[PDB]
């Protein structure tokens, strides 16, 4: 029983593949040998605890480095002219120009400038000194230690929970909606009201004076007497400076809307009310399902009773409760689908409605924070679709799902794949033809001959929000609508002042280039959805190979016969759609960074004239913003962007190195390693050294994964460098 | 910076010693015949 011990079939492999696949089949717990239901769910539960401990031990070190090597107090004194320091650098390979050039933010040595928005976050939430961040780091060290204790505890046989506890979906949803989403957002509200609002108003509220510092002039009297408007009585004025007592109000739960006029960020009183609202509604929504007390819902009978009587949905959702509850890949795919749609809702709502103080002014931090959640969301959504494919191979029972909606997806799967194919082809011919046409017209000396389409649907939606720039004047931009008159005394005085401003990123002025790149975005989502729906629905089998389910999920191919069956598996469709999410989110974040990099220095006409054709994208965005990127180090000297100039070139290595695994395939390298094995076995003084693992080439799935991971690492490092060097070196 | 010398200690151990601890202990572990 060698490594890997979870799979007996890989332990008898005498090659290097045994070393490789044991790393990659390490967390695929259900594919293990001598493996049961209880061990599956308990190992997944303790792996969740280890994941929670890693997240909290990560946050602890991102708090410890700000408290220890970062100037959080100096950034708190002046958040506009001080660069936030992540951590100090101890590199033995620096020369004296590198030590003298990485010393930023008034530090004593070479430090890294934090582009993660942790200073803006911790400032808005109430943390002011380094001692508060250190106490938070020790507290989250304790929390991660408690989660390690709980992870070890639930693997002990006294505290092992059974699968019936794990598959209790009603109790899990009630205690998740009530506890995880309700009492934590009500806990939050208690922080935002007790700590963050008085620290925005200058009052230092800590644990020593928690029971004495009253958050309102009349606290908990008007709450229980019903007059809640006392908590919205005296809001913060427009002369309020953040962190100071002057210009401040006393109301803890306002409904002002819009932005704080000095930080260009959301009001802590609004976010406190926001959390009291997504706390009351989640504790009320957490009393829905039936657990132990007679009242509630059984979701099995909800899904059984939700059948349309015309038969257009077949049996409806009958048999889907056992389908989700028995399949961990269905629950994980649903969780990652929801998580991608909310990690992208995170990205879309922290740039346009900045929630943290002095985050809108720090431009490259905002750029990093958008690109972060759009790449983490384009890998979470692809993981959702890949887990739908793994559900259809190793977890979907056609007998249990008989003529329900999930079986009817397989019944008309060629219609879904062909219509996603039509939509992708439509968007591709139209977007490419219009961009290439606008390229030809700028090439042929005639900018007026472009097909420029004003995006009047989304401009109509912006005028429906309150933008008076386009002059549609339908609702919330005209005073004759009932929605405006229902809102003009309640939230719209903040919202209209925030949306009619042209310096912020709240619902920006869009044009024909925005139309064209939104069809690029629709092309990217549609073609990624095409490959992923095609992988998920041809997961069990297809007309080329009907027994794809009996070959597992991530099998390489089926041989050169029947024309050729390369990339036939559903993992290979996931593999081909990782390139499409990289291209999609590359287009998304190209559009974001160029729409904002022209907004921040003022000349939005550069984007309005140049984004309609791809030579403007190549020249005015990829070439123009890379001026101080690749000049980070020269023969003459090196700048502070030099690490971002190396990380850019580094990306062009790793990405191109992926091509070595994605173009060249196995048997060339297998014969090459055969010649290498002969050469080592015949070389004098080196033949004495043996291998225990037989040297083989990388296997076919492993080759696609290694090329895909290299492609992804190079792709995220070329853009992390360019994006954090073409905004942080030319601020604006 | 509070203690400037812990950069000079932990970056050599977690950068040189700890991979030399981890990769040598794994190479023993992955090539155990058991």
């Amino acid at each position: 029983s060698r490594f890997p011990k979870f799979s007996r079939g890989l332990s008898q492999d005498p090659t290097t593949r045994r070393i490789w696949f044991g790393i990659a089949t390490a967390h695929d717990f259900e594919s293990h040998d001598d493996m049961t239901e209880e061990r599956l769910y308990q190992k997944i539960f303790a792996s969740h605890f280890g994941q929670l401990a890693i997240i909290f031990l990560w946050t602890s070190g991102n708090l410890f480095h700000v408290a220890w090597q970062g100037n959080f107090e100096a950034w708190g004194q002046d958040p506009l002219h001080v660069r936030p320091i992540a951590h100090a650098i101890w590199d033995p390979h620096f020369g004296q120009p590198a030590v003298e050039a990485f010393t930023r933010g008034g530090a004593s040595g070479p430090v890294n400038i934090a582009y993660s928005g942790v200073y803006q976050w911790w400032y808005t939430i109430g943390l002011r000194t380094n001692q508060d961040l250190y106490g938070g780091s020790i507290f989250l060290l304790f929390v991660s230690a408690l989660f390690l204790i709980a992870g070890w505890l639930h693997l002990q046989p006294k505290w092992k929970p059974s699968v019936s506890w794990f598959k209790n979906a009603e109790s899990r949803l009630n205690h998740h909606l009530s506890g995880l989403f309700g009492v934590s957002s009500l806990a939050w509200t208690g922080h935002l009201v007790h700590v963050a609002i008085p620290e925005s108003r200058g009052e230092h509220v800590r644990w020593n004076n928690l029971l004495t510092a009253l958050p309102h002039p009349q606290g908990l009297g008007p709450f229980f007497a019903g007059q809640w408007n006392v908590y919205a009585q005296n809001p913060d004025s427009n002369s309020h400076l953040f962190g100071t007592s002057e210009g401040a109000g006393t109301a803890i739960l306002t409904f002002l809307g819009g932005f704080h006029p000095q930080t260009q960020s959301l009001w802590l009183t609004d976010m406190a009310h926001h959390h009291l609202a997504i706390a009351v509604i989640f504790i009320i929504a957490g009393h829905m399902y039936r657990t132990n007390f007679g009242i509630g819902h059984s979701m099995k009978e909800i899904l059984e009773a939700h059948t349309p009587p015309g038969g257009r949905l077949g049996r409806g959702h009958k048999g889907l409760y056992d389908t989700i509850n028995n399949s961990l890949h269905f629950q994980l795919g649903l969780a990652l689908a929801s998580l991608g749609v909310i990690t992208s809702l995170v990205a879309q709502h922290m740039y346009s409605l900045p929630p943290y103080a002095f985050l809108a002014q720090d431009f490259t931090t905002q750029a990093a924070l958008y690109t972060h959640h759009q790449y983490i969301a384009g890998f979470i959504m692809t993981g959702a679709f890949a887990h739908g494919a793994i559900f259809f191979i190793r977890d979907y029972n056609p007998e249990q799902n008989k003529d329900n909606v999930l079986a009817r997806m397989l019944e008309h799967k060629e219609a879904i794949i062909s219509h996603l194919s039509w939509a992708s082809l439509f968007l591709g011919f139209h977007t490419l033809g219009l961009y290439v046409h606008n390229d030809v017209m700028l090439a042929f000396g005639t900018p007026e001959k472009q097909i420029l389409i004003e995006p009047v649907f989304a401009q109509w939606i912006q005028s429906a929000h309150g933008k008076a720039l386009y002059g549609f004047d339908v609702l919330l931009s005209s005073a004759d609508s009932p929605a405006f008159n229902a809102g003009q005394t309640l939230w719209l005085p903040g919202w209209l002042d925030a949306i009619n401003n042209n310096s912020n990123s709240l619902f920006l002025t869009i044009g024909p280039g925005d139309f064209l790149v939104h069809h690029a975005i629709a092309l990217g989502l549609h073609t990624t959805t095409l490959i992923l729906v095609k992988g998920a629905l041809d997961a069990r089998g297809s007309k080329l190979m009907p027994d794809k389910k009996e070959f597992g999920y991530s099998f390489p191919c089926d041989g050169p016969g029947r024309g050729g069956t390369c990339d036939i598996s559903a993992w290979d469709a996931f593999y081909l759609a990782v390139f499409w999410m990289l291209n999609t989110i590359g287009w998304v974040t190209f559009y974001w960074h160029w729409k904002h990099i022209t907004l921040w220095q003022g000349n939005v006409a550069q984007f309005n004239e140049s984004s309609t054709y791809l030579m403007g994208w190549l020249r005015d965005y990829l070439w123009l913003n890379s001026s101080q990127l690749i000049n980070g180090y020269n023969p003459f000297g090196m700048n502070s962007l030099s690490v971002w100039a190396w990380m850019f070139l580094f990306g062009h290595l790793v990405w191109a190195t992926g091509f070595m695994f994605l173009i060249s395939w196995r048997g060339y390298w297998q014969e090459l390693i055969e010649t290498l094995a002969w050469a080592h076995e015949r070389t004098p003084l080196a033949n004495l050294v043996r291998w225990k693992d037989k040297p083989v080439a990388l296997s076919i799935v492993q080759a696609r994964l290694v090329g895909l991971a290299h492609f992804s690492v190079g792709y995220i490092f070329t853009y992390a460098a360019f994006l954090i060097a073409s905004t942080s070196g030319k601020f604006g | 910076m509070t203690a400037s010398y812990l950069p000079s200690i932990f970056v050599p151990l977690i950068g040189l010693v700890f991979p030399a601890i981890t990769m040598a202990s794994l190479f023993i572990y992955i090539e155990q015949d058991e």
Binding site: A46, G50, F64, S137, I138, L141, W152 | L6
Partner: peptide, 30 residues
């Protein structure tokens, strides 16, 4: 700014956390 002795408190509490991470990894093995 934080002090010298507070770094000692953090390093012990991370070493205690590193033991509890080592204890879970032994139990995840078994």
């Amino acid at each position: 700014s934080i002090s010298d002795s507070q770094i000692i408190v953090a390093l012990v509490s991370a070493f205690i956390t590193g033991i509890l991470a080592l204890r879970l990894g032994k139990s995840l093995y078994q």
